[PDB]
A paper describes a structure:
Results: We describe crystal structures of four unique bispecific VHHs that engage and activate the cytokine receptor pairs IL-18Rα/IL-18Rβ and IL-2Rβ/IL-2Rγ.
We inserted 16, 24, 32, and 48 residue-long rigid helix linkers into the IL-2 SCA DR638, thus enforcing distances between the VHHs ranging from 24 to 72 Å. Similarly, in our IL-2 system, the use of static helix linkers derived from Myosin VI to enforce spatial separation between VHHs also allows for tunability, where increased separation also led to reduced activity.
Residue numbers in the entry: 1 to 246
Write the structure that this text describes.
Amino acid sequence: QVQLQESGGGLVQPGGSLRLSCTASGFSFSSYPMTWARQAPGKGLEWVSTIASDGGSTAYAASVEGRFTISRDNAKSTLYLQLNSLKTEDTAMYYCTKGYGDGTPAPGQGTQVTVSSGGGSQVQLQESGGGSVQVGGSLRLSCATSGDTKSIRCMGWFRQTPGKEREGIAAIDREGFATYADSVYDRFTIAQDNAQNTLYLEMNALKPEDTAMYYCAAQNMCRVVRGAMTGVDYWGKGTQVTVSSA
């Protein structure tokens, strides 16, 4: 049974960003193309974007081309829509469907996106990609920035393990200049895709000492010493990374 559930909608101002998720169950999600469509008050269901089963092909409506990006994580049976540079006319209920745009959402589906000058000015950060890996292994963390993200000048990563002080480990500006804590240098890489409102932490050569809750952080004015941000304005809720040997 095909079961889809959208999330990540909300209220932003023009020029803001949102990241929609659609979690799939009850079918081989990775075998099928998937689609986002949207319905604005008193209008028909409009096709927005389609992505191939394997993620390697995409298509977009002319009205969103260059602003929205479809993606998927087949290991997590989840479909995403990154909504950058939001406009008032992007306001709609957004729906995920199996296939190419001929599918109809089931009752109960939908996440509301509202783009309004009357929305608040707020930033939200959300990490993902934590897991349990072996010593010497690799992991990639992501951080989605949503809301009024235009003010951000620098982003970075912190970590904290039970019993120890939080540690700032890497930071980066919009031009891509980065610094690192000595503890992670030449093992971890921070990268971004600010066109896509995403920050990454590529983690290689993992050690047990790397086991920690990892958090992303942002600020409106860059203040960093050796990878460690001070004067942090915004921060996420955390993703756990556990490095062990069995």
